Design an enzyme around this catalytic site. Sequence first.
Site, mmCIF file in Angstrom:
data_model
loop_
_atom_site.group_PDB
_atom_site.id
_atom_site.type_symbol
_atom_site.label_atom_id
_atom_site.label_comp_id
_atom_site.label_asym_id
_atom_site.label_seq_id
_atom_site.Cartn_x
_atom_site.Cartn_y
_atom_site.Cartn_z
ATOM 1 N N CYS A 1 90.709 40.198 13.915
ATOM 2 C CA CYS A 1 91.468 39.550 14.283
ATOM 3 C C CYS A 1 91.270 38.203 13.496
ATOM 4 O O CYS A 1 90.312 37.860 13.547
ATOM 5 C CB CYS A 1 92.287 39.596 15.498
ATOM 6 S SG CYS A 1 91.061 38.674 16.764
ATOM 7 N N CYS B 1 87.244 40.202 18.370
ATOM 8 C CA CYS B 1 87.903 40.253 17.531
ATOM 9 C C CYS B 1 88.184 39.524 16.114
ATOM 10 O O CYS B 1 87.621 40.171 15.833
ATOM 11 C CB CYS B 1 89.506 41.285 18.293
ATOM 12 S SG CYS B 1 90.914 39.538 18.523
#
EC number: 3.2.2.-
Length: 252
Positions: free
Chosen positions: A157, A75
């Site tokens: 992320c 991520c």
Amino acid sequence: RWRQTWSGPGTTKRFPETVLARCVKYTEIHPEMRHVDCQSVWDAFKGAFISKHPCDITEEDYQPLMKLGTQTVPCNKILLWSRIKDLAHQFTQVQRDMFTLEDTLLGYLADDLTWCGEFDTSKINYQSCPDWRKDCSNNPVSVFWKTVSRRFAEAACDVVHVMLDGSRSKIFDKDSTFGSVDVHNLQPEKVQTLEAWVIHGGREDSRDLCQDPTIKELESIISKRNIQFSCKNIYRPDKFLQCVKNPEDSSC
Ligand SMILES: N=c1c2ncn3c2ncn1[C@@H]1O[C@H](COP(=O)(O)OP(=O)(O)OC[C@H]2O[C@@H]3[C@H](O)[C@H]2O)[C@@H](O)[C@H]1O
């Protein structure tokens, strides 16, 4: 004939065999995708748009396909990109420093393809398919990329990067899928910073395009979501790709 139903180009030739071969090739290369049955993937892909009116497609039409195409991508290594496809892929090809939507099974299946069906029948329309602007936005190709771009942005992320074409008159385009879907689907709880790389198109190191009005719009939208914004100019994209290739590369 001399007049088609829609304004967009027709389904890419051999679309079913192409998607199926792409799913085989992808799942042979990427080990974490070996649970995947390619027939199942093709069936779910077709199910999304065959026998449906190509101006009435919804994200739910693609959920079976999304379920089957479920894939973890690291991520913190996501590269978004808008309107500058070649460099984004040449970059991630060198050593998989980052992952773009086309590095995912579903993105790889659909890249560069066009598809649509017909309401009345189970045939693929190889003659013409709805244009997003003239005919309708809820067509099989546009809805597919919104749906997959939304889930890819949701998975990001830490620091997420975006490559932007700095030779467009709208470097950041609020109407692009990046501007209308991705920026609004990064999760502020998980994403610390969006870092834009604005790719220059000529001259070399001309203006500081990180000062461009559209970049300032992007910064204010992102900052207002509680995510930090960073921007960098890539003045000489050629020199940038060579530097990526030649780590400790005598200038890189
Ligand atoms: N890989 C493609 C692709 N390949 C060909 N096409 C693709 N559209 C999106 N994708 C991917 O979705 C993302 C969002 O697309 P968007 O900016 O809407 O494409 P646009 O710059 O609006 O280009 C969209 C057009 O280009 C065709 C689509 O058939 C068609 O809709 C792209 O950055 C790219 O990652």
